[PDB]
Amino acid sequence: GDQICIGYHANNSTEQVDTIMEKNVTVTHAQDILEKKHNGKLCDLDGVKPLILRDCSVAGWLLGNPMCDEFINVPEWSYIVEKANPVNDLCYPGDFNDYEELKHLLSRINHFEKIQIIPKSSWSSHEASLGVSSACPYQGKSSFFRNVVWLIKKNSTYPTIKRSYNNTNQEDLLVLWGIHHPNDAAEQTKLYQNPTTYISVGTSTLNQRLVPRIATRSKVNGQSGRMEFFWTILKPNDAINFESNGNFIAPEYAYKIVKKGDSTIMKSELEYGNCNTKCQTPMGAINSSMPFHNIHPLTIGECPKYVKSNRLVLATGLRNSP
Amino acid sequence: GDQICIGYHANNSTEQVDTIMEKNVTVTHAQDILEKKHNGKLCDLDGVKPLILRDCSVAGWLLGNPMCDEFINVPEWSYIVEKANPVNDLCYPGDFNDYEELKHLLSRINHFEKIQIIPKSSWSSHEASLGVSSACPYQGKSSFFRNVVWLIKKNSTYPTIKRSYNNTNQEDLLVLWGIHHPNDAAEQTKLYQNPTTYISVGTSTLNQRLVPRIATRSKVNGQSGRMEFFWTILKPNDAINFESNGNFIAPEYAYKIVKKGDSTIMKSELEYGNCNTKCQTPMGAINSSMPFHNIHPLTIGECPKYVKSNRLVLATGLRNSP
Amino acid sequence: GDQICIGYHANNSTEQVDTIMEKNVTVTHAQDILEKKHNGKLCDLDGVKPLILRDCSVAGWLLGNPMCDEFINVPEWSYIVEKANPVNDLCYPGDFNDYEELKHLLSRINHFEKIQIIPKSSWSSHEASLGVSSACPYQGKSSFFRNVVWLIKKNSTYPTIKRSYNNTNQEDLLVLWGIHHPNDAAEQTKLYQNPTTYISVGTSTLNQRLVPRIATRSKVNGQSGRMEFFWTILKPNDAINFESNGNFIAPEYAYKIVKKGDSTIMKSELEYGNCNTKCQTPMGAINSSMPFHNIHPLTIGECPKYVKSNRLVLATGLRNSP
Amino acid sequence: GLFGAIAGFIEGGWQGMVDGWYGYHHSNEQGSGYAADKESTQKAIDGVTNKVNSIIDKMNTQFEAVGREFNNLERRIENLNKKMEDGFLDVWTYNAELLVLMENERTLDFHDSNVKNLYDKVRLQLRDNAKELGNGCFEFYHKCDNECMESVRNGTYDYPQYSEEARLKREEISS
Amino acid sequence: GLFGAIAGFIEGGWQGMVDGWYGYHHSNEQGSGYAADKESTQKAIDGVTNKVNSIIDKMNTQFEAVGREFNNLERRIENLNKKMEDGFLDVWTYNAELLVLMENERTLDFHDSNVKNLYDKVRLQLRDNAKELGNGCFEFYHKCDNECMESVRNGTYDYPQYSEEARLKREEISS
Amino acid sequence: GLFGAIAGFIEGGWQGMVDGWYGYHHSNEQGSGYAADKESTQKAIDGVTNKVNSIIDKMNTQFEAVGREFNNLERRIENLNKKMEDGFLDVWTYNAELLVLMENERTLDFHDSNVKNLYDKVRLQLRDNAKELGNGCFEFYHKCDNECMESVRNGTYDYPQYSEEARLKREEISS
Ligand SMILES: *[C@@H]1O[C@H](CO)[C@@H](O[C@@H]2O[C@H](CO)[C@@H](O[C@@H]3O[C@H](CO)[C@@H](O)[C@H](O)[C@@H]3O)[C@H](O)[C@H]2NC(C)=O)[C@H](O)[C@H]1NC(C)=O
Ligand SMILES: *[C@@H]1O[C@H](CO)[C@@H](O[C@@H]2O[C@H](CO)[C@@H](O[C@@H]3O[C@H](CO)[C@@H](O)[C@H](O)[C@@H]3O)[C@H](O)[C@H]2NC(C)=O)[C@H](O)[C@H]1NC(C)=O
Ligand SMILES: *C1O[C@H](CO)[C@@H](O[C@@H]2O[C@H](CO)[C@@H](O)[C@H](O)[C@H]2NC(C)=O)[C@H](O)[C@H]1NC(C)=O
Ligand SMILES: *[C@@H]1O[C@H](CO)[C@@H](O[C@@H]2O[C@H](CO)[C@@H](O)[C@H](O)[C@H]2NC(C)=O)[C@H](O)[C@H]1NC(C)=O
Ligand SMILES: *[C@@H]1O[C@H](CO)[C@@H](O[C@@H]2O[C@H](CO)[C@@H](O)[C@H](O)[C@H]2NC(C)=O)[C@H](O)[C@H]1NC(C)=O
Numbered sequence A, B, C: 001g002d003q004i005c006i007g008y009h010a011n012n013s014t015e016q017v018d019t020i021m022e023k024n025v026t027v028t029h030a031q032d033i034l035e036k037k038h039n040g041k042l043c044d045l046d047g048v049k050p051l052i053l054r055d056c057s058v059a060g061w062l063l064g065n066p067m068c069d070e071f072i073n074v075p076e077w078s079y080i081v082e083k084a085n086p087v088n089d090l091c092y093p094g095d096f097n098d099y100e101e102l103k104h105l106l107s108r109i110n111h112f113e114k115i116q117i118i119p120k121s122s123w124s125s126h127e128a129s130l131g132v133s134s135a136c137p138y139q140g141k142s143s144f145f146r147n148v149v150w151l152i153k154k155n156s157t158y159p160t161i162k163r164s165y166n167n168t169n170q171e172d173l174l175v176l177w178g179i180h181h182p183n184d185a186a187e188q189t190k191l192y193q194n195p196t197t198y199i200s201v202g203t204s205t206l207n208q209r210l211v212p213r214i215a216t217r218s219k220v221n222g223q224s225g226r227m228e229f230f231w232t233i234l235k236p237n238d239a240i241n242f243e244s245n246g247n248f249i250a251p252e253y254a255y256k257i258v259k260k261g262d263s264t265i266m267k268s269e270l271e272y273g274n275c276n277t278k279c280q281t282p283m284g285a286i287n288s289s290m291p292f293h294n295i296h297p298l299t300i301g302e303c304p305k306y307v308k309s310n311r312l313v314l315a316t317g318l319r320n321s322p
Numbered sequence D, E, F: 001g002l003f004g005a006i007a008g009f010i011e012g013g014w015q016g017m018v019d020g021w022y023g024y025h026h027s028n029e030q031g032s033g034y035a036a037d038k039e040s041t042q043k044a045i046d047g048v049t050n051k052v053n054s055i056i057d058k059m060n061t062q063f064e065a066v067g068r069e070f071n072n073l074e075r076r077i078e079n080l081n082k083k084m085e086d087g088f089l090d091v092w093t094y095n096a097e098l099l100v101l102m103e104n105e106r107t108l109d110f111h112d113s114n115v116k117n118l119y120d121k122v123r124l125q126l127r128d129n130a131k132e133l134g135n136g137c138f139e140f141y142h143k144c145d146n147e148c149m150e151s152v153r154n155g156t157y158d159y160p161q162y163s164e165e166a167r168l169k170r171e172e173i174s175s
């Protein structure tokens, strides 16, 4: 007689697959659902560069830490990248108020521009160029934050400062200032004449009065004094008024800012690689299509769901067993 | 010979369905799983009305903003509805302490009743009926929050206030008070004789001392002064003691309150429609049965899970293809 | 002729199972997927005991509440257990700053040891052994927190305290201090000579100045005064400086602390049962294998997902119907 | 259809049948017609309804929840909440979609299965007393009437009755 | 049962069988009895166990977590946490319940499938050397004994042996 | 394989076939060979691809999100976030793994199903004009050629043509 026989394909494939009821099943064709490849660099998010502070904290950068720079004349960014432990933070020891909140606000910026709000030389009846310490060494010469001024008494006098700035720009503006909390009463008189002192700042919103807190503390970068910093967004048509009797660290520069979206600060020791993704990782970018990845939990972007496994291998073909 | 043939139903249905392996499959009968219908009104939650503040913030309401009313003489509510940007907030510019927390506390109330705690006329040796401003215009006449009193010096004197109230009701009661932070020293003396001043409030829990903060600020509703408010729950048997030398904005009314559960503040421009649901939405109520909806994420009640899709259509019948 | 018939198993099982399409289906063999058994005691997490405060709040324990003890000379723990409403908290009424955050920090500790930081007898020119009240009755004799000293004027004088401690240990150390907020001016003078008063504490981090707040309050455990407490972690090489004029509640003891992980505070009325698990529950431990349990939501450990159901019964055998 | 039913031997389903979901179509010497099968159709309705219901009823955990509440100095927390809401949206959206896809498939196969069941019940009830056409149809080796086909639906067709009428009628067609 | 097995031609399963899950029941000229099939029953146990295990083993992600921690000026956040806990409970509760429902269904069908597999293996091994009763039972055209049915289980039944014994025995019944 | 196909009557699949996934293997009087079936193989490719795609495409909700941001006096909140992230990882990890497991199973059964479909299409097209070997193979009662098997694939095999050639050839083998 004559025959016909029905059969199925089989090839030289050795790729295994798992089943609800069976393990290590040899299959004709298979498809990995799980992304495992990254590119080991930092990239633009949707064609917008990150802000990569190299050895600086955000604080370090915003205040002018002498060892950081103001070279971050990048007008716009999509996310910020700090190192694990940036080396350049507050050269002069101190504190920064609502730092994290400020960091979050700054994580993604549509426009950012540095403006000389109160110019270093307009302090006619106070000493502007002397507030300088070995805690912030610039080039062997001792120094201090660039974007902020440490005012000292002129002659043996510190007149009450009364001074304000109208935001006549259209952009919101971020403004910063600080107090010096000296170590002791002598140190007070030496820097500012007056024993009792205050800074008061008012906005349409802000209503603060700082008062220096004198106390023996431990030296930090050789300094037992402390610097405490403060900020706000000054709204387009508003005005900020400062008034001090003196422990005042005056703004010099402030930032025009246009904020149109949030992101986060990423921690990575990687460097920029001219490059773009829709999804970024402290270990590198992902050119995603898979709905799952196992690279790293702390992503930024439109990413595959992060998963804890090595294999998500889906069966295309059939039971290809020798 | 004779026949019998087995076949299946087919009708004039054109409703399509999707399958893991097939798209646009024509089917005999089908069932939508996804709720899409709302009724465009705000309704009671389980037969309990919401509190709909019309043009008032909660703050505006609680303090007596002149343009708000005390007509919110509804005893009980299940959730609150503020507008996006209520027009009547703090007529006199200022701040409210732990405002959100208090909003959250107030979002759902079992009983609520306004009680005269310290009568506006018991201030014999201070001026009670003068604390009034053009920032809170009532009917052309200028004025001020209703539920709270802005005490001014009588003759040229402001005796130290010592004053307390025992909560002798069974209900917790919510109590509110403020400081005035004047613009300058002259303004201080004008309203209150004394240059140095304080309010201190004590409970079995609260232990505060406020001190007015003088500063040049920008005018807001024509005022560069500020009002700062504060609150607590005064427990049934307890007692609150006020003492001031004077920048004191004294309670007149406080609120009996019985809290038996939480909800939230909803933002909607809709109005009440006499009506009931088990699930509400800023765009309207849902008479739910389906396990999924796509109307709006910000719901209140027992809701179908909110989902991002148009079709969750489940196959009832079979392959009805022409 | 001769026969063979194909059939399937059937036994005397009456265990039912449910199906997407069928309910109450009788089955040959079945497997429960849902854990329901606990052992009704508290156990070590991975061989590390919990800290079971019996009638004491953490505050009560940390401060030396006389009715608590310092018997908690257990050097390490994996989680803390407080009762719902511990009876022994702040015998002297008052407040504890960042109490929850401290609780959280303490929930799991690698090493913990109590060190005499500023010894009770080193107060030569102040009264150390008098700060005692009936609010903290010890054995009929009235008394006060053990780990902290309530300094009073000697003769009729309270010299300004200037005093510091260097952390020369390798371990971080947790330090605590308080202010006393008297009821009135007379009470002030009585305890400390000086009418105007401050405590200021400084670290490489901490920069605080406290000022007692005088006010009529309600008696609590017969006391209208109040005690406010504060804390920090003093870093290995750092130093804490105290300076007071006097409403100071001085540390006597502080804690060396090595933190290598977090957990939480569990609320339970249960007692220790010598015993171990990888997963604990206020109602008892679970020896888990199942991927789901329905015992209790507030677990600590590596647990099965908590679920709302009684039956997760999976079919092993087949349709065993009589 | 997987079970050789819908996409297989039975090409197209009879619209002429309103009775139920599954059924028969006779063409005997009286006339012709279609009366649906009932235990089958009934067990299916039950099953589909049940599937729909359990898909609804097993969520019967949901409970009271809410909308959104932080000031613009708590933006990190607002973000926290966004993520969480966002994440649940991603889970539920994905699950619901695939749940539907998967169950829709199993449904259409469930029907095919039953059809083949019904086909095979008839087939076995009358071994070689009938011819297997391949259209999903059976031709009788003997003559048959209306009352005749009642037992066919019943499950009370008697093989040894019309066997020798078929057996001789079978050899007549042979060669 | 979907494959015509349990709810179909084999009405009821033999309790008399303890050997395994699936099997045979002979009634030859020696006597009668039931010895279960082994490769089949074994492959099933394997499968079911495996399903149970993977359902357990694939969660093997869970890890350290906790209970609850905000004061009453942090109620908004307490609510945030509630929502999240609540939302996970709704997810897990729903999935687990439907997982069981769906997989239970597939299980009972998996058994039906194997039964029909076993039925059809026997059926094909001996084409027209046996009669198809419809009770899930086969009658031999020839005589058979105990050693005879070993090859039947084995899969070593020889068709061309008892063919002409059946072939003549088939025409004897015909007419 | 559940449908008696892969683990059943067809032991092993032909590697000799590159054409497609499913097919035939003739051994007529010209020679022998295997040309795959196309509508079947095509409908399968479509189906599998579709499954893969929908598994990818139905997540098409994801959107912008982020990393980690609280100071060490906000540890309780850091914990809150951890739990949330952790919880999502547990959800996705479990779902993905089981999804794959379940769908892998349904895939391998889907193939078995189609094979049996194809087997049964051939089988019915030519009732007793062919012999059912049991190897998944059919032997013709008559002689057959290459052009002969085109209609066999086509679905245009004519039964009443070679019926009496089979019928007489059937009795010749009988006894
Ligand atoms: C910062 O300076 C700006 C600009 O000088 C101030 O806003 C300005 O204030 C003027 C005059 O007060 C405003 O003009 C006013 O407009 C309304 C109608 O809109 C009119 O009825 C008034 O009579 C008045 O003319 C306007 O907003 C703006 N001036 C212009 C021409 O742009 C702002 O007040 C300053 N910041 C603060 C808070 O002091
Ligand atoms: C807390 O007390 C410890 C005591 O061990 C202090 O650490 C010590 O600090 C001194 C400086 O104050 C260091 O001495 C220095 O040593 C170099 C030579 O090695 C010498 O030329 C300098 O004159 C200088 O004084 C010493 O290295 C260091 N010892 C240790 C063990 O680290 C610590 O500074 C105290 N905390 C503070 C900041 O008060
Ligand atoms: C507020 O007044 C209430 C109501 O009278 C006081 O409660 C009484 O106070 C006495 C005095 O100690 C106690 O016997 C009981 O607590 C209460 N008696 C009754 C019959 O209620 C309460 O003391 C007052 N609160 C304060 C802070 O003084
Ligand atoms: C199932 O197959 C996989 C093959 O990938 C097995 O994984 C083994 O793990 C070792 C490491 O010990 C690898 O080097 C090999 O790929 C695998 N071993 C061998 C010898 O094949 C897995 O262990 C196998 N069986 C099961 C289910 O445990
Ligand atoms: C099958 O599904 C939908 C629904 O019918 C189709 O959406 C259509 O898109 C194409 C043009 O892109 C048109 O045929 C129709 O006008 C659309 N229908 C709608 C949404 O009304 C879908 O494209 C169909 N299949 C494909 C891939 O074309």
Ligand SMILES: *[C@@H]1O[C@H](CO)[C@@H](O[C@@H]2O[C@H](CO)[C@@H](O)[C@H](O)[C@H]2NC(C)=O)[C@H](O)[C@H]1NC(C)=O
Binding pocket: C023, C024
């Ligand atoms: C399927 O069977 C279960 C067996 O537990 C039934 O459970 C009963 O539920 C009722 C509620 O109406 C209780 O009063 C009984 O205590 C339970 N029965 C017993 C004694 O086992 C369940 O109701 C059944 N499902 C349905 C509704 O058919």
